[PDB]
């Protein structure tokens, strides 16, 4: 069963972490760009996307962090199999 | 925060033949019509100089965009012709059965004035001109097995050519993008990185995984081409694919479950060359384009367009600011979004350098089946793509100087990297000047040292492997490091990327496909010739760019323009001071430097790599005479030019007799060019006066007054004929030679 | 794209609200790429063509969605002979996937009649977009009386295309147009579902539904990656 | 059409047609009378 396996858990955790990090102001988002000093500052969005989320979390943040989460998860899954851990 | 959006103007221009009947309409000067023959040349010279027809950037951009559709449409006609001639006038089908004995041919001549002798005996019951373009090897790799498949591609090529010409007309006469559209550099890079290169690589991986790999796996096994399954049968029937590659039995579940190791059977990392065909494994090539697809698709999400996330290219440039460089990269973003010439200067430089890198990598890692053992194709492709790279780089200097004269504005450039470079140009050119003199003495002087010592009967005093030695120790170390890479630094690679590093030779059909290349004293000497001739070409072109606007001789050179002959005989003489003349001189040195590169390649391969495998060992075409002979200028004259030109001068009466004719004709055009280079239009204008008098005497004098060519056109006509004659001479000499023996 | 109904969908953006004012049917503010912006529009990317094209796609898709499954449903119920209980992609449209022998003519003979018939239907429809009302002028066997259009290309109306003159009131017509667009958009996704499901599973749309209901967990997109 | 025929009358277009005609005539003559060396 794929569900609950090591591969599935890592991908769900990595995807969840990026969404959680971005939503709670731990990663850059659509409304917060990052300065040269790796600090979050307000940004200007040409196509201001309306969102009812109290923090302004838009659907773009989901796609941005969904792909970022998948990239992180895929690397970990394949990396562990490389060293024999997985 | 200007939004990224589509912006056009409706019906900007009217489609009429009115202006087709009014030559010179584009320019105010030429619109009045001709009075002297100089007008005719000016019409063609300034036709595509859009930046000088109008001062409106938007109008310039729209012409560039549509002129590019015309270039694309022309390539499709050319590509369509190559595929069509393969279907109708080629022996491709016979070649598939016996690739090692049948010479590729895709051109046939009509039987007129006795030219049918050029239809040589190429094999497969076919008569035609042998081709060195390598199209047969490319078609085999992709999986083409019938002339019907070639025919359909040609028809598709013409449809694409029609679409390209429609697009050019549509986007100039019907819906022309506005200037703000052209200036979305962030958006363009995103689409061109992830969309053009990224999806293009992924799409081609799909073809290789589903068409090329199955077809070539059976072809190598010896299956008759007509009995191989058709590509669509492979696509529709997963059962067939499972037989060739069992991984297909599991579908795409491994891809989504991250069990990517399941696909190890067709996504390999072998390295080396396929022993049966002598070319790269297609399974390796598929994993290459899959990896490249992911890298570029990720690369296409870097720049900010409409949704906040991403980078601003202006912000990156302005943040990279150091203590040694004043303001830094400030102002470059405005330069590179308002000057087409500045963009062209960069792109030509790297596009040309890429074409040269292609030449080196394709010969060392032959990517197509039966490409290596076809010595005519290996020599032609390496030489073709080196010449293309050479011309592009010289163009990069030409259009860097055009930017410096026309698009450069001091107000926007104050104490930035560009400004500071101009402020120590004497330091740069003086140092680069000395480096060239140093490299000329210590590389070409060694050849003169060897030639004199050899003529004096003092071989022990020469620079050679049996005498004073100059070993490329640094290059030899790198060859050994790459040879041992699979053991420790690339553990998951089975073999070295190329057989040039070391190991054992691969032989296909009794001929060597690739074997280790040894670097000795001769290789040391020739390489430092390359560094010398390249550094001189940089000196000429860089000098033209840095001194385009002014110098200690002409303080106001910018006002004179980019292309003028001189500023008169004053100050001792100022002939050829314009930046255009630095391109004119740079073309000669580029031709000089690349000629040695392709002579180095031709002699080294025949001497040390190419040859016939036999029981005793490898016998090379020129028998390993490069090491002992290429250390003197006399050796090159006798062993390379005089000995190998035997084939071309004995070509008369055979199918190669055409190369003999072009060999003489090329010699003629080259010498003809020296008439324009060694003379000046002052003599010729006076000569035409006497010739015009004879016509006046007979009431047959023209209404358009004859004029001797301008000063600049004499130099342009001279260099064009000089290059054509020189390059065509080598072209005939190479093909008649390698086809005859290789 | 927010499912169901709502004032605005997920992708609605402040930029798209500039020109999306609810005038068009099914205007839920969803235009993240801003293709319907009137400013500096041209070519085929303009509001009039894009809105017209969506309706045309909607109407073809609705016929396709109902026609690509009816043979399977009717065949499953025994209302048509089993010889015609054929998957939509095995009718003859894609002979490599499957072809049906038994039509009154060869499928290429039938195609020529399709070409000629659609040339008249489609080029006459086009000429009303380029020159509104122009198809009601030149003699066409007296049929030009019903081709006068109504000024809006996508909604010709008239005695035939509005046979039963439904939506007489302005309010009623707006509701009908909204219902047409939503059903049309739903059918466009259904047709894409038929195409994707055919490749992934190789079975008809009706078979996929029946299998899913049997064992929903063991029959879905995730399990069909491998078989 | 007047302008298009004017374009065909330009020097480069006329020369292409004229030499295409002239070359074709010479090629065809040598196709039916191969190897002419003496009037005879
Ligand atoms: C738990 C975390 C984790 C672990 C344990 C690993 C472990 C591994 N990764 Mg992975 N990886 C991870 C996370 C992880 N990864 C993440 C998050 C990402 C996404 C950024 C990646 C992306 C990634 C890539 C792209 C690759 C690996 C590779 C590897 C394997 C070989 C690495 C090596 O020795 O390179 C040593 C390599 C060098 C010393 C070469 C350096 C010289 C460079 C390449 C020259 C060019 C530089 C520049 C472009 C010019 C190794 C098993 C490699 C692999 O598949 O190996 C089989 C590989 O190609 N990983
Ligand atoms: C890069 C483009 C290109 C080039 C350089 C050539 C060159 C040639 N073609 Mg090819 N051809 C091309 C594209 C090209 N073709 C395309 C795209 C098609 C598809 C329509 C064809 C279809 C085609 C045919 C059908 C034939 C040729 C033939 C020829 C030869 C004689 C042409 C001639 O004098 O016509 C006459 C000159 C004028 C009309 C003026 C010549 C070697 C002929 C050949 O090789 O015969 C043995 C021949 O029969 N070509
Ligand atoms: C039949 C269609 C048509 C017509 C009537 C016009 C008419 C016009 N165009 Mg348009 N145009 C068309 C198609 C057409 N265009 C297409 C298909 C494109 C896409 C490439 C363009 C792109 C375009 C641009 C970018 C511009 C025009 C311009 C013009 C004006 C002058 C053109 C002129 O003098 O041409 C006479 C020129 C020629 C006959 C040269 C033809 C060149 C083509 C590409 C063939 C190249 C062959 C190649 C060299 C072969 C190798 C040669 C070797 C063997 C020796 C005029 C209003 C100009 C304008 O409005 O300026 C204000 C302008 O700047 N057009
Ligand atoms: C761009 C590249 C590309 C493309 C186009 C394909 C395409 C394909 N691959 Mg390949 N593949 C690729 C890259 C690619 N591959 C790469 C990089 C790898 C390495 C990881 C593989 C590894 C791989 C494996 C291991 C397998 C395939 C398979 C397949 C086939 C079935 C895939 C499937 O189940 O789709 C599922 C569903 C879809 C793709 C969606 C289809 C959507 C349709 C087109 C929508 C149509 C809608 C329209 C409105 C309807 C028509 C209406 C009209 C008639 C009126 C298919 C031909 C499988 C196969 O059969 O191989 C023989 C298979 O087993 N591929
Ligand atoms: C992407 C490539 C590219 C592009 C788009 C351009 C574009 C331009 N260049 Mg640049 N250039 C390039 C590459 C490019 N260049 C390269 C590679 C070089 C190095 C050789 C140069 C060197 C160069 C110079 C020195 C100059 C330009 C100029 C120009 C401008 C006017 C050109 C013109 O009117 O030509 C009109 C075209 C012709 C007159 C036809 C030339 C025909 C050649 C000589 C034929 C050669 C032989 C042939 C290929 C094969 C045999 C033929 C057979 C019949 C015997 C224009 C903006 C000129 C300018 O003023 O810019 C501001 C200018 O002075 N370019
Ligand atoms: C074979 C012909 C030839 C030769 C020998 C040279 C030589 C030179 N050219 Mg020239 N050039 C040539 C053809 C030639 N050119 C042509 C045809 C053109 C027209 C396109 C040009 C255009 C051109 C340009 C535009 C430039 C050069 C440059 C140079 C110099 C390169 C660097 C240097 O100092 O090297 C070292 C010198 C040599 C290799 C010459 C031979 C030295 C001998 C072998 C050893 C010394 C002899 C020894 C002392 C014994 C003497 C005894 C005696 C006194 C009794 C050099 C003086 C570049 C320059 O000036 O760079 C600084 C430069 O910018 N050339
Ligand atoms: C360099 C290529 C290029 C570029 C940058 C543009 C750019 C533009 N074009 Mg032009 N165009 C091009 C080539 C290009 N065109 C060609 C080759 C043609 C002839 C076929 C046209 C015909 C054309 C028309 C008729 C129109 C434009 C329009 C536009 C504008 C909007 C484009 C858009 O949003 O498309 C987004 C794309 C789509 C909506 C269609 C997507 C699907 C297409 C039909 C096929 C794509 C195939 C894909 C690349 C590969 C699939 C692989 C496999 C699955 C088969 C924009 C200024 C429009 C305009 O003026 O707007 C103001 C407009 O009306 N273009
Ligand atoms: C875009 C719409 C569309 C298209 C292109 C198709 C296409 C197809 N359908 Mg499908 N179908 C559709 C929509 C569509 N269908 C819809 C919406 C439904 C649900 C109602 C169905 C239900 C359906 C079934 C149940 C079947 C098909 C079948 C077929 C196939 C055979 C067609 C045939 O024989 O027609 C026959 C032709 C006609 C009905 C038109 C007759 C034209 C003459 C000239 C009219 C003469 C009229 C007369 C003079 C006066 C009126 C008389 C009247 C009052 C009695 C073909 C692949 C069959 C199939 O798959 O077979 C293998 C099949 O069994 N379809
Ligand atoms: C090497 C020199 C690196 C030099 C290097 O990296 O310098 C680094 C230094 C960069 O300083 P900054 O930190 O202030 O630069 C900030 C950057 O972001 C640019 O604005 O560059 C300069 O000072 C420019 C002038 C260098 C002048 C160099 C003169 C010697 C040239 C020798 C050429 C040899 C070519 C060999 C080819 C193989
Ligand atoms: C809290 C909340 C909620 C929830 C939410 C959720 C639950 C979400 C989810 C979400 C998700 C869950 C998402 C996801 C996404 C994903 C994505 C977007 C992906 C992507 C991917 C990619 C892009 C990939 C790529 C690749 C490939 C293909 C190959 C290899 C490499 C790589 C990896 C790169 C709601 C709203 C209800 C309500 C309110 C609150
Ligand atoms: S006219 Fe000729 S010789 Fe006199 S300065 Fe000008 S380029 Fe030199």
From Swiss-Prot, chain A:
The UniProt record lists the keyword Membrane: yes
Disulfide bonds: none
Keywords for this protein: Chloroplast, Membrane, Photosynthesis, Photosystem I, Plastid, Thylakoid, Transit peptide, Transmembrane, Transmembrane helix
Designated name of the protein: Photosystem I reaction center subunit psaK, chloroplastic
One GO CC term on file: chloroplast thylakoid membrane
Keyword DNA-binding included in the entry's annotation: no
Domain of life of the source: Eukaryota
Membrane topology: Multi-pass membrane protein
Spans traversing the lipid bilayer: 2-22, 59-80
Residues of the full protein shown: 28 to 113 of 113
Subcellular localization(s) per the UniProt record: Plastid, Chloroplast thylakoid membrane
Curated annotation (Swiss-Prot), chain B:
Statement: the UniProt record of this protein carries the keyword Lipoprotein: no
Annotated binding of phylloquinone, by residue: 684
Protein origin, superkingdom: Eukaryota
Record's GO cellular component terms: chloroplast thylakoid membrane; photosystem I
Residues noted as binding chlorophyll a' in the record, renumbered to the chain: 667
GO molecular function: 4 iron, 4 sulfur cluster binding; chlorophyll binding; electron transfer activity; magnesium ion binding; oxidoreductase activity
Subcellular localization(s) per the UniProt record: Plastid, Chloroplast thylakoid membrane
Transmembrane residue ranges: 64-87, 150-173, 189-213, 285-303, 340-363, 379-405, 427-449, 524-542, 582-603, 656-678, 716-736
Residues reported in the UniProt entry to bind [4Fe-4S] cluster: 566, 575
Keyword annotations: 4Fe-4S, Chlorophyll, Chloroplast, Chromophore, Electron transport, Iron, Iron-sulfur, Magnesium, Membrane, Metal-binding, Oxidoreductase, Photosynthesis, Photosystem I, Plastid, Thylakoid, Transmembrane, Transmembrane helix, Transport
Main location: plastid
A GO BP entry: photosynthesis
Cofactor: how and how many bound: P700 is a chlorophyll a/chlorophyll a' dimer, A0 is one or more chlorophyll a, A1 is one or both phylloquinones and FX is a shared 4Fe-4S iron-sulfur center.
Topological type in the membrane: Multi-pass membrane protein
Reactions performed catalytically: reduced [plastocyanin] + hnu + oxidized [2Fe-2S]-[ferredoxin] = oxidized [plastocyanin] + reduced [2Fe-2S]-[ferredoxin]
The keyword rRNA processing is annotated on this UniProt entry: no
EC number: 1.97.1.12
Similarity remark: Belongs to the PsaA/PsaB family.
Subunit structure comment from the entry: The PsaA/B heterodimer binds the P700 chlorophyll special pair and subsequent electron acceptors. PSI consists of a core antenna complex that captures photons, and an electron transfer chain that converts photonic excitation into a charge separation. The eukaryotic PSI reaction center is composed of at least 11 subunits.
The protein, known as: Photosystem I P700 chlorophyll a apoprotein A1
Encoding gene, per UniProt annotation: psaA
Curated annotation (Swiss-Prot), chain D:
A biological-process GO annotation: photosynthesis
Membrane is among the record's keywords: yes
Membrane protein topology class: Single-pass membrane protein
Taxonomic superkingdom: Eukaryota
Localization terms from the record: Plastid, Chloroplast thylakoid membrane
Gene Ontology terms: cellular component: chloroplast thylakoid membrane; photosystem I
Statement: the UniProt record of this protein carries the keyword Acetylation: no
Pfam families documented for this protein: PSI_PsaJ
TM helices/strands, residue ranges: 7-27
The entry's keywords: Chloroplast, Membrane, Photosynthesis, Photosystem I, Plastid, Thylakoid, Transmembrane, Transmembrane helix
The family this protein is said to belong to: Belongs to the PsaJ family.
Record function comment: May help in the organization of the PsaE and PsaF subunits.
Name assigned to this protein: Photosystem I reaction center subunit IX
């Amino acid at each position: 069963g794929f569900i609950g396996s090591s591969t599935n858990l890592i991908m769900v955790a990595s995807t969840t972490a990026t969404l959680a990090a971005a939503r709670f102001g731990l990663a850059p988002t659509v409304k917060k760009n990052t300065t040269a000093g790796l600090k979050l500052v307000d940004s200007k969005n040409s196509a201001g996307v309306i969102s009812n989320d109290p923090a302004g979390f838009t659907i773009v943040d989901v796609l941005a962090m969904g792909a970022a989460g998948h990239g992180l998860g895929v690397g970990i899954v394949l990396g562990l199999k490389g060293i024999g851990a997985l | 925060a200007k939004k990224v959006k589509i912006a056009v103007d409706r019906n900007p221009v009217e489609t009429s033949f009115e202006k087709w009947a009014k030559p010179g309409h584009f320019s105010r000067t030429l619109s009045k019509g001709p009075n002297t023959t100089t007008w005719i040349w000016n019409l063609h010279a300034d036709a595509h100089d859009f930046d000088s027809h109008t001062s409106d950037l938007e109008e310039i951009s729209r012409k560039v965009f549509s002129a590019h559709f015309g270039q694309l449409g022309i390539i499709f006609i050319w590509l369509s012709g190559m595929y069509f001639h393969g279907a109708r006038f080629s022996n491709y089908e016979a070649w598939l059965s016996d690739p090692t004995h049948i010479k590729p041919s895709a051109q046939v001549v009509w039987p007129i004035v006795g030219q049918e002798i050029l239809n040589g005996d190429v094999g497969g019951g076919f008569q035609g001109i042998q081709i060195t373009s390598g199209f047969f090897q490319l078609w085999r790799a992709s999986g083409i097995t019938s002339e019907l498949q070639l025919y359909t591609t040609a028809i598709g090529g013409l449809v694409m050519a029609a679409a390209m010409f429609f697009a050019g007309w549509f986007h100039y006469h019907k819906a022309a993008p506005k200037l703000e559209w052209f200036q979305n550099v962030e958006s363009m890079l995103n689409h061109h990185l992830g969309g053009l290169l990224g999806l293009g690589s992924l799409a081609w991986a799909g073809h290789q995984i589903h068409v090329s790999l199955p077809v070539n796996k059976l072809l190598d096994a010896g299956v008759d081409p007509k009995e191989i399954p058709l590509p669509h049968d492979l696509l529709l029937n997963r059962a067939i694919m499972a037989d060739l590659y069992p991984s297909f039995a599991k579908g795409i579940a491994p891809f989504f479950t991250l069990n990517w190791s399941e696909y190890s059977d067709f996504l390999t990392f072998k390295g080396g060359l396929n022993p049966v065909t002598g070319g790269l494994w297609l399974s390796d090539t598929a994993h290459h384009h899959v990896a490249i697809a992911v890298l570029f698709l990720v690369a296409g999400h870097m720049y900010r367009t409409n949704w906040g996330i991403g980078h601003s290219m202006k912000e990156i440039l302005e943040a990279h600011r150091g203590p040694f460089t004043g303001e830094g990269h400030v102002g470059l973003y405005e330069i590179l979004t308002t000057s087409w010439h500045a963009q062209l200067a960069i792109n030509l430089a790297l596009f040309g350098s890429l074409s040269i890198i292609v030449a080196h990598h394709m010969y060392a890692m032959p990517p197509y089946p039966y490409l290596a053992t076809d010595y005519g194709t290996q020599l032609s492709l390496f030489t073709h793509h080196t010449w293309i790279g050479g011309f592009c780089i010289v163009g990069a200097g030409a259009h860097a100087a055009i930017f410096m004269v026309r698009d450069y504005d001091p107000t926007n450039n104050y104490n930035n990297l560009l400004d500071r470079v101009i402020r120590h140009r004497d330091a740069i050119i003086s140092h680069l000047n000395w480096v060239c003199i140093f490299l000329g003495f210590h590389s070409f002087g060694l050849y003169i040292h060897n030639d004199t010592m050899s003529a004096l009967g003092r071989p022990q005093d020469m620079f050679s492997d049996t005498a004073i030695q100059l070993q490329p120790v640094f290059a030899q170390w790198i060859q050994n490091t790459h040879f041992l890479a699979p053991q420790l630094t690339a553990p998951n690679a089975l073999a070295a990327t190329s057989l040039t590093w070391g190991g054992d030779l691969v032989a296909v059909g009794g001929k060597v496909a690739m074997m280790p290349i040894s670097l000795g004293t001769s290789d040391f000497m020739v390489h430092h010739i390359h560094a010398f001739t390249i550094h001189v070409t940089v000196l000429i072109l860089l000098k033209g760019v840095l001194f385009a606007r002014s110098s200690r001789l002409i303080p106001d050179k910018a006002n004179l323009g980019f292309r003028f002959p001189c500023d008169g005989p004053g100050r001792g003489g100022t002939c050829q001071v314009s930046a255009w003349d630095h391109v004119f001189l740079g073309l000669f040195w580029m031709y000089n430097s690349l000629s040695i590169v392709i002579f180095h390649f031709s002699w080294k391969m025949q001497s040390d790599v190419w040859g016939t495998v036999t029981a005793s060992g490898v016998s090379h075409i020129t028998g390993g005479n490069f090491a002992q002979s290429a250390n003197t200028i006399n050796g090159w004259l006798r062993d390379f030019l005089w000995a190998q030109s035997s084939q071309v001068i004995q070509s008369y009466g055979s199918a190669l007799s055409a190369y003999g004719l072009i060999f003489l004709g090329a010699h003629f055009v080259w010498a003809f060019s020296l008439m324009f280079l060694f003379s000046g239009r002052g003599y010729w204008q006076e000569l035409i006066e006497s010739i015009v008098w004879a016509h006046n005497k007979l009431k047959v004098a023209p209404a358009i007054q004859p004029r001797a060519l301008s000063i600049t056109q004499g130099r342009a006509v001279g260099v064009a004929h000089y290059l054509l004659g020189g390059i065509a001479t080598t072209w005939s000499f190479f093909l008649a030679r390698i086809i005859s023996v290789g | 794209v927010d499912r169901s109904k709502d004032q605005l969908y997920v992708g609605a953006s402040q930029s798209s609200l500039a020109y999306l004012d609810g005038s068009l049917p099914g205007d839920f503010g969803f235009d993240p790429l801003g293709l319907l912006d009137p400013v500096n529009s041209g070519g085929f990317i303009e509001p009039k063509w894009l809105q017209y094209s969506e309706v045309i796609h909607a109407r073809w898709a609705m016929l396709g969605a109902a026609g690509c499954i009816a043979p399977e449903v009717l065949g499953a119920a025994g209302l048509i002979p089993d010889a015609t209980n054929i998957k939509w992609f095995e009718s003859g449209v894609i002979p490599p996937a499957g072809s049906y022998n038994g039509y009154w003519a060869d499928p290429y003979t039938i195609f020529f009649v399709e070409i000629v018939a659609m040339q008249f239907a489609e080029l006459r429809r086009l000429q009303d977009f380029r020159y509104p009302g122009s198809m009601g002028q030149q003699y066409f066997l007296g049929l030009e009386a019903i081709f006068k259009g109504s000024g809006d290309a996508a909604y010709p109306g008239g005695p035939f295309f509005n046979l039963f003159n439904l939506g007489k009131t302005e309010a009623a017509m707006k509701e009908l147009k909204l219902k047409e667009i939503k059903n049309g958009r739903l059918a466009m996704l259904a047709m894409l579902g038929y195409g994707a499901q055919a490749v992934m599973t190789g079975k008809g749309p009706f078979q996929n539904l029946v299998e899913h209901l049997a064992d929903p967990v063991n029959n879905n997109i995730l399990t069909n990656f491998a078989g | 059409m007047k302008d298009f025929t004017t374009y065909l009358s330009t020097a480069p277009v006329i020369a292409t047609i004229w030499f295409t005609f002239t070359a074709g005539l010479l090629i065809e003559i040598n196709r039916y009378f191969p190897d002419p060396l003496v009037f005879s």
